[PDB]
Structure formats: C-alpha cells, structure tokens
Amino acid sequence: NLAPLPPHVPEHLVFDFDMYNPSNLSAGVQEAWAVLQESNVPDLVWTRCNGGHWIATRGQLIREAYEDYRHFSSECPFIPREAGEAYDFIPTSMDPPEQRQFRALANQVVGMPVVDKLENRIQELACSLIESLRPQGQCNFTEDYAEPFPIRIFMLLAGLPEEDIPHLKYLTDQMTRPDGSMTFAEAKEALYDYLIPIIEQRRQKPGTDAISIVANGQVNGRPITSDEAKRMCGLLLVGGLDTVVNFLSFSMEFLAKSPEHRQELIERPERIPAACEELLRRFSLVADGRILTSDYEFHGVQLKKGDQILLPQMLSGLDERENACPMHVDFSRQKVSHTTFGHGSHLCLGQHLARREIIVTLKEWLTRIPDFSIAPGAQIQHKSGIVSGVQALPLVWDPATTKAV
Numbered sequence: 576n577l578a579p580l581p582p583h584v585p586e587h588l589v590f591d592f593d594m595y596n597p598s599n600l601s602a603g604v605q606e607a608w609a610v611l612q613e614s615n616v617p618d619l620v621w622t623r624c625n626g627g628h629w630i631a632t633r634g635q636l637i638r639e640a641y642e643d644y645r646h647f648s649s650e651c652p653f654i655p656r657e658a659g660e661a662y663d664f665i666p667t668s669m670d671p672p673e674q675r676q677f678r679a680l681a682n683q684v685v686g687m688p689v690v691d692k693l694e695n696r697i698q699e700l701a702c703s704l705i706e707s708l709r710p711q712g713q714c715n716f717t718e719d720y721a722e723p724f725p726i727r728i729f730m731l732l733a734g735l736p737e738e739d740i741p742h743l744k745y746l747t748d749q750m751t752r753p754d755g756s757m758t759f760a761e762a763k764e765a766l767y768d769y770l771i772p773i774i775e776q777r778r779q780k781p782g783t784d785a786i787s788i789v790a791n792g793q794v795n796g797r798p799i800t801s802d803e804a805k806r807m808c809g810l811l812l813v814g815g816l817d818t819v820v821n822f823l824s825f826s827m828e829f830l831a832k833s834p835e836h837r838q839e840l841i842e843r844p845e846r847i848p849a850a851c852e853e854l855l856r857r858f859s860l861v862a863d864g865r866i867l868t869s870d871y872e873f874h875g876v877q878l879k880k881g882d883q884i885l886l887p888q889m890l891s892g893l894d895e896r897e898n899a900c901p902m903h904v905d906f907s908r909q910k911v912s913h914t915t916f917g918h919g920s921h922l923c924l925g926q927h928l929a930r931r932e933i934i935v936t937l938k939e940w941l942t943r944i945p946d947f948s949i950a951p952g953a954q955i956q957h958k959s960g961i962v963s964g965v966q967a968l969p970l971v972w973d974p975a976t977t978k979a980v
C-alpha cells in the first residue's frame with residue numbers, strides 16, 4: 576500500500592520506508608531505522624507508505640528543520656495526516672510565539688523544581704520494586720518494572736488512580752503504536768472522555784497535583800480554558816505513560832547482554848550520568864514530524880506547502896557524521912551528540928524527570944542485581960511507531976548473586 580507519487584517528487588528521491596513496520600525489525604528498531612543512513616540513501620527521501628511523506632535522514636537536516644518553525648510547522652506533527660490532523664495537544668501542536676505561554680505552564684508542572692521534590696519517592700519506588708523482584712530470579716521487565724516504575728510516579732504527580740493505568744496505557748499506545756483497533760481520533764476522544772470530568776472537578780476544588788495546576792493556570796495574563804487544559808493534560812499523559820517505559824526496556828535489554836557495561840557502572844559509578852547520555856543516544860526512540868506551511872526549497876529539494884516531513888529525533892545520534900561508530904555503546908565518548916529529547920522550541924520539558932528515573936533505575940538495579948541475562952530462548956521483539964518499544968523482556972538471574980540493601 577504505496578500511495579501514488581505526487582508530481583513534485585523526483586523518483587530518485589523515493590525510498591519506501593514504513594515508519595510503522597520497517598524492514599529488518601528483527602535486528603532491532605534503531606537498526607531498522609539506520610537503513611535510512613546507508614550510502615545508497617539520499618539525505619532527504621520520499622516514502623510512499625502511510626500516505627506519502629518526506630524523511631530527513633541526517634542530524635544536520637533534522638536540527639535545521641526543527642529550528643525552522645516558519646517553514647516547518649508543528650500544526651500536524653504526526654504521520655499519517657489524519658493522526659497529525661486530529662492531533663491537538665498543547666504545546667506540541669503550536670508554534671512560537673503562541674507555544675511559549677503554554678510551555679511555561681507545563682514547565683511549572685514537570686520542570687526541575689518538581690523533580691527535585693519528587694526525588695525521594697522516585698528512589699523509594701525503584702528500591703521497593705527491585706527488592707520485591709530480586710528473590711524471584713526472574714521477571715518480565717517490561718511489565719514488572721519498566722511500566723509500573725514511571726507510571727505510578729506519574730499517577731502520583733498527576734493525582735490520578737493507579738486503577739486507571741491499564742485503560743490509560745491502552746489509549747496512549749494506540750497513539751504512538753497504532754494497532755489498527757482504533758484510529759487516532761477515537762483514541763484521542765476516549766482519553767478526552769476520561770480527562771474532562773477530572774478537569775471540571777479540579778477547577779472547582781483545586782489540589783496540589785499537576786492536573787489542578789494546569790486546570791487553573793494562567794496563560795497570556797488570563798485563565799486557561801477547559802479545552803486548553805484538556806489539551807495540555809492530554810499530552811502530559813502520553814509523555815508520562817509512553818516514553819520512559821520504552822526507554823528502560825531498551826537500556827535493560829542492552830545491559831542484560833553486556834556484562835562489561837554493567838561492571839563498568841558498578842566500579843566507576845561516577846560514570847552513570849555519562850552512560851545515561853550514551854544510552855539515550857544509542858536507544859533513542861522518538862520519531863515525529865512537521866508540516867510545510869508553504870513552498871520551500873530545502874537542501875536542493877522542492878517541498879510543497881502541505882507536505883509532511885518526518886524528522887526522526889532517533890536518527891541524529893545514530894548518524895556517523897555526528898558520532899563515530901554509532902551503533903557501538905561507549906560510556907567514555909568525548910562528545911555524545913543526540914536530539915533524543917528533540918530540538919528547537921519544542922525541546923522536551925520532561926527531560927529532567929526522565930533522566931532522574933533512568934539514573935536511579937541503573938544505580939538501584941546494578942546494586943541489588945549486578946548480574947542478570949535474557950532468558951534462554953526468549954526472542955526479544957521491538958515495535959516501531961511515533962515512540963518505538965520492546966514487546967516483552969524476560970530476564971533471569973541467580974538469587975544467590977544478588978544483594979539486599
């Protein structure tokens with residue numbers, strides 16, 4: 576299901592990549608996408624999948640396109656178009672200067688000062704969950720840790736019921752990794768059916784939670800609207816539920832396979848922060864785009880107003896022009912260059928939260944369970960989409976080599 580080539584696209588620029596089902600997923604998701612950076616691929620390609628759209632394949636182009644909101648609008652950031660079209664999240668679906676007042680608020684809710692406050696719970700929950708696992712010598716990391724960890728912290732932050740997780744997590748998943756069970760609009764609406772009542776209720780009787788802060792926030796000297804709050808909160812949910820969850824599994828799948836990487840971290844703890852950047856670079860997992868606001872010529876290619884371009888944040892750090900031996904993980908790189916948390920005016924506000932959550936998990940897991948591996952005959956599957964992930968992660972360990980703290 577390849578869409579006929581628009582008139583403006585030079586056939587020599589065609590490269591049919593399916594962002595939802597890349598070709599050699601079997602070898603890994605980061606690996607499947609890096610095909611785009613082989614020598615045979617032009618820097619800017621056109622794919623006929625998912626209705627036809629462009630893809631920038633290099634760090635340099637992605638950064639540029641990201642900086643350039645005039646040409647490249649966030650108005651319709653998801654592919655396919657019906658998804659980008661139904662997409663109305665704030666601040667994501669807005670460009671500057673409008674973007675800015677909304678950003679400042681979302682920042683109040685997820686920014687540094689909040690992570691600083693939530694630190695001890697993050698550390699408490701990680702230790703608790705790990706200690707609970709330690710004696711079994713086996714889990715489902717995706718389900719047993721990766722999911723609960725980041726999710727319960729967000730539920731805390733948000734002041735929402737843990738009971739709502741499953742229902743919520745299903746809708747978030749349809750957003751980034753469309754199943755086919757429900758379209759973007761249906762998915763979007765059901766999350767919205769959920770949030771509305773909650774918002775209503777926090778306008779009336781404010782709490783200390785993130786939702787309360789958003790619902791009653793100020794934007795452009797006036798009060799945010801209901802619809803506006805619904806829309807920021809909608810985003811906070813997807814980021815909360817869907818980002819850290821998938822990243823931990825990639826990192827953990829790697830650690831489970833690389834004894835010497837684990838050891839390095841065990842002996843030279845001072846390196847965790849660096850390793851965290853390197854892992855974010857290597858196991859980078861987001862890919863969204865932008866819409867052309869007009870006719871524009873970018874690096875010799877003619878882009879037509881209304882064309883969507885995917886600008887894979889995942890790709891920047893995997894690009895050889897940016898990082899020597901990109902597929903290799905080296906905790907001692909002089910320069911770790913990525914754009915895992917995006918680039919430009921839309922730079923991820925929750926970055927601080929995600930880094931704290933990764934750093935704690937590594938430090939904490941390695942402490943109790945320094946030696947683990949993937950279960951014999953478990954075949955690890957990755958999935959592709961706006962946010963890629965791991966399907967399941969069966970780990971096994973000997974209890975006798977663990978440590979209680």
Ligand code: HEM
Binds near residue numbers: 678812924926929
């Ligand atoms: C591994 C973790 C994460 C990664 C890789 C990630 C990635 C990204 C990327 C690439 C963008 C920009 C997208 C664009 O330019 O269209 C972004 C935006 C955003 N992310 Fe993060 N994210 C992560 C965690 C989170 C968390 C935990 C939160 C908190 C809910 C969150 C909240 C946000 C928000 C609010 C924005 C929008 C900022 C704006 O539009 O000005 N993200 N994220």
Ligand SMILES: C1C2CC3CC1CC(C2)C3
Binds near residue numbers: 810814818961962
């Ligand atoms: C929208 C944007 C791209 C992906 C998915 C969702 C949350 C965050 C920002 C990462």
